[PDB]
Design a protein around this ligand. Structure first.
Ligand SMILES: [Mg+2]
Ligand SMILES: [Mg+2]
Ligand SMILES: [Mg+2]
Ligand SMILES: [Mg+2]
Ligand SMILES: [Mg+2]
Ligand SMILES: [Mg+2]
Ligand SMILES: [Mg+2]
Ligand SMILES: [Mg+2]
Ligand SMILES: [Mg+2]
Ligand SMILES: [Mg+2]
Ligand SMILES: [Mg+2]
Ligand SMILES: [Mg+2]
Ligand SMILES: [Mg+2]
Ligand SMILES: [Mg+2]
Ligand SMILES: [Mg+2]
Ligand SMILES: [Mg+2]
Ligand SMILES: [Mg+2]
Ligand SMILES: [Mg+2]
Ligand SMILES: [Mg+2]
Ligand SMILES: [Mg+2]
Ligand SMILES: [Mg+2]
Ligand SMILES: [Mg+2]
Ligand SMILES: [Mg+2]
Ligand SMILES: [Mg+2]
Ligand SMILES: [Mg+2]
Ligand SMILES: [Mg+2]
Ligand SMILES: [Mg+2]
Ligand SMILES: [Mg+2]
Ligand SMILES: [Mg+2]
Ligand SMILES: [Mg+2]
Ligand SMILES: [Mg+2]
Ligand SMILES: [Mg+2]
Ligand SMILES: [Mg+2]
Ligand SMILES: [Mg+2]
Ligand SMILES: [Mg+2]
Ligand SMILES: [Mg+2]
Ligand SMILES: [Mg+2]
Ligand SMILES: [Mg+2]
Ligand SMILES: [Mg+2]
Ligand SMILES: [Mg+2]
Ligand SMILES: [Mg+2]
Ligand SMILES: [Mg+2]
Ligand SMILES: [Mg+2]
Ligand SMILES: [Mg+2]
Ligand SMILES: [Mg+2]
Ligand SMILES: [Mg+2]
Ligand SMILES: [Mg+2]
Ligand SMILES: [Mg+2]
Ligand SMILES: [Mg+2]
Ligand SMILES: [Mg+2]
Ligand SMILES: [Mg+2]
Ligand SMILES: [Mg+2]
Ligand SMILES: [Mg+2]
Ligand SMILES: [Mg+2]
Ligand SMILES: [Mg+2]
Ligand SMILES: [Mg+2]
Ligand SMILES: [Mg+2]
Ligand SMILES: [Mg+2]
Ligand SMILES: [Mg+2]
Ligand SMILES: [Mg+2]
Ligand SMILES: [Mg+2]
Ligand SMILES: [Mg+2]
Ligand SMILES: [Mg+2]
Ligand SMILES: [Mg+2]
Ligand SMILES: [Mg+2]
Ligand SMILES: [Mg+2]
Ligand SMILES: [Mg+2]
Ligand SMILES: [Mg+2]
Ligand SMILES: [Mg+2]
Ligand SMILES: [Mg+2]
Ligand SMILES: [Mg+2]
Ligand SMILES: [Mg+2]
Ligand SMILES: [Mg+2]
Ligand SMILES: [Mg+2]
Ligand SMILES: [Mg+2]
Ligand SMILES: [Mg+2]
Ligand SMILES: [Mg+2]
Ligand SMILES: [Mg+2]
Ligand SMILES: [Mg+2]
Ligand SMILES: [Mg+2]
Ligand SMILES: [Mg+2]
Ligand SMILES: [Mg+2]
Ligand SMILES: [Mg+2]
Ligand SMILES: [Mg+2]
Ligand SMILES: [Mg+2]
Ligand SMILES: [Mg+2]
Ligand SMILES: [Mg+2]
Ligand SMILES: [Mg+2]
Ligand SMILES: [Mg+2]
Ligand SMILES: [Mg+2]
Ligand SMILES: [Mg+2]
Ligand SMILES: [Mg+2]
Ligand SMILES: [Mg+2]
Ligand SMILES: [Mg+2]
Ligand SMILES: [Mg+2]
Ligand SMILES: [Mg+2]
Ligand SMILES: [Mg+2]
Ligand SMILES: [Mg+2]
Ligand SMILES: [Mg+2]
Ligand SMILES: [Mg+2]
Ligand SMILES: [Mg+2]
Ligand SMILES: [Mg+2]
Ligand SMILES: [Mg+2]
Ligand SMILES: [Mg+2]
Ligand SMILES: [Mg+2]
Ligand SMILES: [Mg+2]
Ligand SMILES: [Mg+2]
Ligand SMILES: [Mg+2]
Ligand SMILES: [Mg+2]
Ligand SMILES: [Mg+2]
Ligand SMILES: [Mg+2]
Ligand SMILES: [Mg+2]
Ligand SMILES: [Mg+2]
Ligand SMILES: [Mg+2]
Ligand SMILES: [Mg+2]
Ligand SMILES: [Mg+2]
Ligand SMILES: [Mg+2]
Ligand SMILES: [Mg+2]
Ligand SMILES: [Mg+2]
Ligand SMILES: [Mg+2]
Ligand SMILES: [Mg+2]
Ligand SMILES: [Mg+2]
Ligand SMILES: [Mg+2]
Ligand SMILES: [Mg+2]
Ligand SMILES: [Mg+2]
Ligand SMILES: [Mg+2]
Ligand SMILES: [Mg+2]
Ligand SMILES: [Mg+2]
Ligand SMILES: [Mg+2]
Ligand SMILES: [Mg+2]
Ligand SMILES: [Mg+2]
Ligand SMILES: [Mg+2]
Ligand SMILES: [Mg+2]
Ligand SMILES: [Mg+2]
Ligand SMILES: [Mg+2]
Ligand SMILES: [Mg+2]
Ligand SMILES: [Mg+2]
Ligand SMILES: [Mg+2]
Ligand SMILES: [Mg+2]
Ligand SMILES: [Mg+2]
Ligand SMILES: [Mg+2]
Ligand SMILES: [Mg+2]
Ligand SMILES: [Mg+2]
Ligand SMILES: [Mg+2]
Ligand SMILES: [Mg+2]
Ligand SMILES: [Mg+2]
Ligand SMILES: [Mg+2]
Ligand SMILES: [Mg+2]
Ligand SMILES: [Mg+2]
Ligand SMILES: [Mg+2]
Ligand SMILES: [Mg+2]
Ligand SMILES: [Mg+2]
Ligand SMILES: [Mg+2]
Ligand SMILES: [Mg+2]
Ligand SMILES: [Mg+2]
Ligand SMILES: [Mg+2]
Ligand SMILES: [Mg+2]
Ligand SMILES: [Mg+2]
Ligand SMILES: [Mg+2]
Ligand SMILES: [Mg+2]
Ligand SMILES: [Mg+2]
Ligand SMILES: [Mg+2]
Ligand SMILES: [Mg+2]
Ligand SMILES: [Mg+2]
Ligand SMILES: [Mg+2]
Ligand SMILES: [Mg+2]
Ligand SMILES: [Mg+2]
Ligand SMILES: [Mg+2]
Ligand SMILES: [Mg+2]
Ligand SMILES: [Mg+2]
Ligand SMILES: [Mg+2]
Ligand SMILES: [Mg+2]
Ligand SMILES: [Mg+2]
Ligand SMILES: [Mg+2]
Ligand SMILES: [Mg+2]
Ligand SMILES: [Mg+2]
Ligand SMILES: [Mg+2]
Ligand SMILES: [Mg+2]
Ligand SMILES: [Mg+2]
Ligand SMILES: [Mg+2]
Ligand SMILES: [Mg+2]
Ligand SMILES: [Mg+2]
Ligand SMILES: [Mg+2]
Ligand SMILES: [Mg+2]
Ligand SMILES: [Mg+2]
Ligand SMILES: [Mg+2]
Ligand SMILES: [Mg+2]
Ligand SMILES: [Mg+2]
Ligand SMILES: [Mg+2]
Ligand SMILES: [Mg+2]
Ligand SMILES: [Mg+2]
Ligand SMILES: [Mg+2]
Ligand SMILES: [Mg+2]
Ligand SMILES: [Mg+2]
Ligand SMILES: [Mg+2]
Ligand SMILES: [Mg+2]
Ligand SMILES: [Mg+2]
Ligand SMILES: [Mg+2]
Ligand SMILES: [Mg+2]
Ligand SMILES: [Mg+2]
Ligand SMILES: [Mg+2]
Ligand SMILES: [Mg+2]
Ligand SMILES: [Mg+2]
Ligand SMILES: [Mg+2]
Ligand SMILES: [Zn+2]
Lengths: 112, 48, 116, 118, 59
RNA sequence: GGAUGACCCCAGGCGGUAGGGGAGCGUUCCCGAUGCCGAUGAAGGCCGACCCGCGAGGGCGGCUGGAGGUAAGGGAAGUGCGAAUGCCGGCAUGAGUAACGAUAAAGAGGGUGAGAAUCCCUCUCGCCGUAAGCCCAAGGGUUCCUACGCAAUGGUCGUCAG
RNA sequence: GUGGAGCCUGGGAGUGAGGGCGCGAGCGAUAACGUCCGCGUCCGAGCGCGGGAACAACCGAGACCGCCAGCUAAGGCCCCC
RNA sequence: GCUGGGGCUAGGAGUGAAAAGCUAACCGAGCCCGGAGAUAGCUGGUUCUCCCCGAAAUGACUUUAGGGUCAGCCUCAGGCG
RNA sequence: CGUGAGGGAAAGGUGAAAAGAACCCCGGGAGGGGAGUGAAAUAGAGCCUGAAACCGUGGGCUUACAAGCAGUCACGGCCCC
RNA sequence: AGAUGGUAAGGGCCCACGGUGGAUGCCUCGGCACCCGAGCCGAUGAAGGACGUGGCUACCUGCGAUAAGCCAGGGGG
């Protein structure tokens, strides 16, 4: 049995969040929580909520035990980018892409 | 430095205004074209 | 009536791109790069089909030569002896003989010396 | 090169850096415990310790010295009268720095607390 | 200066090779000897306020 | 050879730019069609190491898809793209790099809040002061005041804000 | 001498920047990867193949397709080979 | 002398203590729409497959010389043999 | 966009029917997990189909003494059918 | 003495599944061409507009302080 949670359209650049998501793949739920708590990155906040929300579903909807849960799989996909203008010198305009993430966490049970 | 747009409403109306257009044969034609094209504003909007 | 590109072009590209599977980077992913690589690969194959026939013969000649010198004569002597003997067993088979059936190869070496 | 040089610069010029130390002394000496970034915290130690050690001296000279940095007559009065006496037998080390566990959100700056010792 | 510029697009392979050092090291944490919760060493425990065997802070 | 493009046998030719000629394939549309294939699954998509063809291609099978498609034989064209510093769009690279817009400058405490270097309050510190203060006129046109909000706008953050 | 020979009428072109090399000249300096003609050739279009270390035009040879068969051309046969 | 407001002078025209200066961020002749798909003997580009043949870079003339007309050389059809 | 004459875009599709997802859970929200609707929910409104570039996760083979238009021909190792 | 393995910070090829993106097919309220019909409006204030008009109304449409409408005739159910 698995349980998952997906935060879509998170306004942070995929490349940045993955750095944090990579930190908790294959970790026990307790270990991951410990890591995200003291990881000095903006992404840590977001990855945290998806982890908890996935753990929630595991205990609530899917008949799994919080004391067995580990991060079986986790990944960030990229969502639609938010394009914005950045005025440069000599009249030229640049286009900044404020990117977007779809964060997924999938939880499984470590029997024994 | 001093750029090219220096707004002035009297100047704006006395130049591209409706009455200005109607007074000259060339200007009346502007209005004809703009109407024929279906412009929403035949003449520059200006707050008097 | 109008006949827009529609389906035709995507299909032509996929043919190529499937043929280019396995290649490095854009060569297996980009149609244009795939095509440039496939052109080279067509000429290489044709050329290497022709040269494979050479590549093996040279191996065969090296191997026949190795077994000949064990019996005190060289390849160039061995072949001439075979010609004078009128033996027409080819180099593909001579080499196989030289390794699998050494006593049979010995006999051929004998007839090669006898011929001159 | 920085060989054997003592004292941080803390990305402030001379007068600003001085003001920083004086105002933090006023803050520390007023609440007994303040929170700052770890570097500012460590530097604050000696700056205040010297002020405290002068309050221990008590003389008029010492008051006029300490007053150059602290300015507040009420505060200095608290320093000489209330603060200083509980360090009579203690020889230096009137302050302590303990590093906090959580960083600042907006800039990840590491925090720590500075306090007067019991 | 005459405005240097990349000569070739960086390959997906070379881009990713440059990033072989970009991996994060997980935070270094020890248990708090009072409340067993994990925390950075040499830091006052944010869970129970204990450091050096004594209460230092309200949490 | 047989008699005709029925297939077989023998022989010779077959590098190719500009270029001439020939034979085909496929795309949209019309006749064939008041027909035929079709929810027991149309087109289109993703596969295939299978079948036919020299090839362009055509079949067949699996998955997707869910309402169209269309034969033999003929007809007509907006009929095949890899390049035009082509056009329109999408997405990459440089790269977690330059930069984040005057070097007048910040520090702590208290408050609020899911979240606070950035919002509120206090104290300390600095900057302007023939202004970086105040009052008119242009010009702008609700930006004024208050309540409730933070997706986007704010070069960061935001509980704050034109 | 029956050859992708030749001749006649007609349809359709493309070309009208050539280049190396050998031999015969002029020009140049019995100079030039020079230049301008002539006869031939190859590259052009054979940047397909073997040789010349590599190298359009030098030597060998005109590549319809296939073969893990055989004979040779130039060039080679101590090892790279 | 500088400066606010209100006015007048424009495209082969204005204005210019004269720089071919300026006339709405490019003025040896402004901008917009139209003639207009100007014209370009120049540059670039020109999209499926197989089969047969297969050039020219010369001559003459040319406000011609990197463009042409005729000839030469390639190709197809009919005929001649 | 342009002072103005004038220039001048982009942007169509859930399903037969909203039956447009009550309620519960994590979350400040956004989002998601169950429940429910439907023939179908990778038809969930950022909605038919959903190609390619581009980004990622997992698996198999492989790579840190090696010289490269990245293929091609041969043999061998490993994984699969 | 000699020899030959497991190493992957990362990378490469293939496979599977996704994300992004919006091509393809299907569809069409819209467009296009031809033919036919019809062809002037205005000081009785046109064309074209501005501002208004709804119990709650941003915009569009309709309408004009009688303001999504007033009167009468015909149509229709
Ligand atoms: Mg960290
Ligand atoms: Mg829980
Ligand atoms: Mg510019
Ligand atoms: Mg960008
Ligand atoms: Mg003025
Ligand atoms: Mg204005
Ligand atoms: Mg005025
Ligand atoms: Mg005025
Ligand atoms: Mg006027
Ligand atoms: Mg008139
Ligand atoms: Mg209107
Ligand atoms: Mg307009
Ligand atoms: Mg006008
Ligand atoms: Mg098309
Ligand atoms: Mg194509
Ligand atoms: Mg296509
Ligand atoms: Mg396809
Ligand atoms: Mg095809
Ligand atoms: Mg490969
Ligand atoms: Mg291979
Ligand atoms: Mg690739
Ligand atoms: Mg790659
Ligand atoms: Mg790709
Ligand atoms: Mg090919
Ligand atoms: Mg071959
Ligand atoms: Mg070859
Ligand atoms: Mg041979
Ligand atoms: Mg051979
Ligand atoms: Mg070999
Ligand atoms: Mg010997
Ligand atoms: Mg022989
Ligand atoms: Mg032999
Ligand atoms: Mg120095
Ligand atoms: Mg020292
Ligand atoms: Mg100092
Ligand atoms: Mg120092
Ligand atoms: Mg230091
Ligand atoms: Mg500073
Ligand atoms: Mg700094
Ligand atoms: Mg100062
Ligand atoms: Mg100073
Ligand atoms: Mg000292
Ligand atoms: Mg400490
Ligand atoms: Mg913050
Ligand atoms: Mg320089
Ligand atoms: Mg320079
Ligand atoms: Mg430079
Ligand atoms: Mg410079
Ligand atoms: Mg530069
Ligand atoms: Mg460059
Ligand atoms: Mg890339
Ligand atoms: Mg990768
Ligand atoms: Mg790199
Ligand atoms: Mg730390
Ligand atoms: Mg607590
Ligand atoms: Mg034959
Ligand atoms: Mg031949
Ligand atoms: Mg041919
Ligand atoms: Mg030519
Ligand atoms: Mg023919
Ligand atoms: Mg086609
Ligand atoms: Mg056809
Ligand atoms: Mg019909
Ligand atoms: Mg039908
Ligand atoms: Mg049926
Ligand atoms: Mg059905
Ligand atoms: Mg089906
Ligand atoms: Mg169709
Ligand atoms: Mg097929
Ligand atoms: Mg289905
Ligand atoms: Mg199908
Ligand atoms: Mg129908
Ligand atoms: Mg069809
Ligand atoms: Mg049909
Ligand atoms: Mg037919
Ligand atoms: Mg017919
Ligand atoms: Mg037609
Ligand atoms: Mg066309
Ligand atoms: Mg092309
Ligand atoms: Mg360009
Ligand atoms: Mg370019
Ligand atoms: Mg370039
Ligand atoms: Mg383009
Ligand atoms: Mg293009
Ligand atoms: Mg583009
Ligand atoms: Mg970009
Ligand atoms: Mg760099
Ligand atoms: Mg740098
Ligand atoms: Mg920097
Ligand atoms: Mg700057
Ligand atoms: Mg700054
Ligand atoms: Mg300065
Ligand atoms: Mg504060
Ligand atoms: Mg606070
Ligand atoms: Mg804040
Ligand atoms: Mg905050
Ligand atoms: Mg003053
Ligand atoms: Mg006013
Ligand atoms: Mg404005
Ligand atoms: Mg507003
Ligand atoms: Mg007011
Ligand atoms: Mg307001
Ligand atoms: Mg408020
Ligand atoms: Mg906001
Ligand atoms: Mg915000
Ligand atoms: Mg927010
Ligand atoms: Mg913003
Ligand atoms: Mg922001
Ligand atoms: Mg800004
Ligand atoms: Mg305000
Ligand atoms: Mg011929
Ligand atoms: Mg001929
Ligand atoms: Mg002829
Ligand atoms: Mg022709
Ligand atoms: Mg023709
Ligand atoms: Mg010509
Ligand atoms: Mg000529
Ligand atoms: Mg010539
Ligand atoms: Mg020439
Ligand atoms: Mg010449
Ligand atoms: Mg000679
Ligand atoms: Mg000569
Ligand atoms: Mg001479
Ligand atoms: Mg000499
Ligand atoms: Mg020459
Ligand atoms: Mg010479
Ligand atoms: Mg000479
Ligand atoms: Mg010649
Ligand atoms: Mg040529
Ligand atoms: Mg050659
Ligand atoms: Mg030839
Ligand atoms: Mg060679
Ligand atoms: Mg050669
Ligand atoms: Mg060689
Ligand atoms: Mg070679
Ligand atoms: Mg050569
Ligand atoms: Mg040469
Ligand atoms: Mg031989
Ligand atoms: Mg020889
Ligand atoms: Mg040699
Ligand atoms: Mg010899
Ligand atoms: Mg060697
Ligand atoms: Mg040898
Ligand atoms: Mg005056
Ligand atoms: Mg004046
Ligand atoms: Mg004026
Ligand atoms: Mg004036
Ligand atoms: Mg004038
Ligand atoms: Mg005048
Ligand atoms: Mg005028
Ligand atoms: Mg003019
Ligand atoms: Mg004049
Ligand atoms: Mg003057
Ligand atoms: Mg202008
Ligand atoms: Mg101008
Ligand atoms: Mg100007
Ligand atoms: Mg002119
Ligand atoms: Mg004309
Ligand atoms: Mg034009
Ligand atoms: Mg074309
Ligand atoms: Mg030929
Ligand atoms: Mg003559
Ligand atoms: Mg003539
Ligand atoms: Mg000339
Ligand atoms: Mg000349
Ligand atoms: Mg010319
Ligand atoms: Mg001609
Ligand atoms: Mg002839
Ligand atoms: Mg003939
Ligand atoms: Mg303009
Ligand atoms: Mg405007
Ligand atoms: Mg325009
Ligand atoms: Mg457009
Ligand atoms: Mg529908
Ligand atoms: Mg519908
Ligand atoms: Mg809630
Ligand atoms: Mg809750
Ligand atoms: Mg809140
Ligand atoms: Mg929700
Ligand atoms: Mg969830
Ligand atoms: Mg839900
Ligand atoms: Mg059901
Ligand atoms: Mg069914
Ligand atoms: Mg599906
Ligand atoms: Mg569906
Ligand atoms: Mg969809
Ligand atoms: Mg449908
Ligand atoms: Mg999608
Ligand atoms: Mg895709
Ligand atoms: Mg992988
Ligand atoms: Mg070595
Ligand atoms: Mg190795
Ligand atoms: Mg193999
Ligand atoms: Mg090893
Ligand atoms: Mg690896
Ligand atoms: Mg790794
Ligand atoms: Mg590799
Ligand atoms: Mg997908
Ligand atoms: Mg989409
Ligand atoms: Mg009419
Ligand atoms: Mg009217
Ligand atoms: Mg209205
Ligand atoms: Mg009525
Ligand atoms: Mg009635
Ligand atoms: Zn603790």
């Amino acid at each position: 049995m698995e349980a998952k949670a997906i935060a879509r359209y998170v306004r942070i650049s995929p490349r940045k969040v993955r750095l944090v998501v990579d930190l908790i793949r294959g970790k026990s739920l307790e270990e991951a929580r410990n890591i995200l708590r003291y990881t000095n990155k903006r992404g840590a906040y977001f990855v945290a909520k998806v982890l908890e929300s996935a753990a929630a579903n595991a205990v609530n909807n899917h008949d799994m035990l919080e004391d067995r849960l580990y991060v079986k799989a986790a990944y960030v996909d990229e969502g639609p980018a938010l394009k914005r203008v950045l005025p440069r010198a000599r009249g030229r305009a640049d286009i900044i892409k404020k990117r977007t993430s779809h964060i997924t966490v999938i939880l499984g049970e470590k029997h024994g | 430095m001093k750029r090219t747009w220096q707004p002035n409403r009297r100047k704006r109306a006395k130049t591209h205004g409706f009455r200005a257009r109607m007074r000259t044969p060339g200007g009346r034609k502007v209005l004809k074209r703009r109407r024929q094209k279906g412009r929403w504003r035949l003449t520059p909007a200006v707050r008097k | 009536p109008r006949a827009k590109t529609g389906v035709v072009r995507r299909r032509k590209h996929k043919k190529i791109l499937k043929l280019a599977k396995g290649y490095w980077g854009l060569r297996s992913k980009s149609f244009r790069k795939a095509r440039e690589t496939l052109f080279a690969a067509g000429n290489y194959a044709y050329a290497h089909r022709k040269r494979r026939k050479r590549d093996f013969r040279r191996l065969w000649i090296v191997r026949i030569n190795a077994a000949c010198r064990q019996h005190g004569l060289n390849y160039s002597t061995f072949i001439h002896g075979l010609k004078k003997a009128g033996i027409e067993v080819d180099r593909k088979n001579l080499a196989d003989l030289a390794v699998r059936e050494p006593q049979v190869f010995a006999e051929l070496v004998e007839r090669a010396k006898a011929a001159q | 090169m920085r060989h054997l040089k003592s004292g941080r610069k803390l990305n402030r010029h001379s007068s600003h850096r001085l003001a920083l130390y004086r105002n933090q002394a006023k803050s520390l000496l007023t609440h007994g415990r303040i929170t700052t970034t770890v570097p500012k915290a460590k530097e604050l130690r000696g700056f205040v310790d010297h002020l405290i050690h002068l309050a221990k001296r008590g003389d008029l000279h010492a008051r006029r010295l300490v007053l150059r940095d602290l300015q507040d007559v009420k505060l200095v009065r608290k320093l000489f009268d209330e603060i200083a006496p509980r360090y009579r037998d203690r020889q230096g080390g009137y302050t302590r720095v303990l590093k906090l566990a959580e960083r600042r959100r907006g800039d990840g700056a590491p925090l720590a607390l500075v306090e007067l010792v019991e | 200066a005459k405005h240097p510029v990349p000569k070739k697009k960086t390959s997906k392979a070379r881009r990713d090779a440059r990033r072989s050092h970009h991996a994060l090291t997980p935070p270094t944490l020890v248990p708090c000897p009072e409340c067993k919760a994990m925390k950075p060493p040499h830091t006052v425990c944010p869970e129970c306020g204990y450091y050096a065997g004594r209460k230092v802070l309200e949490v």
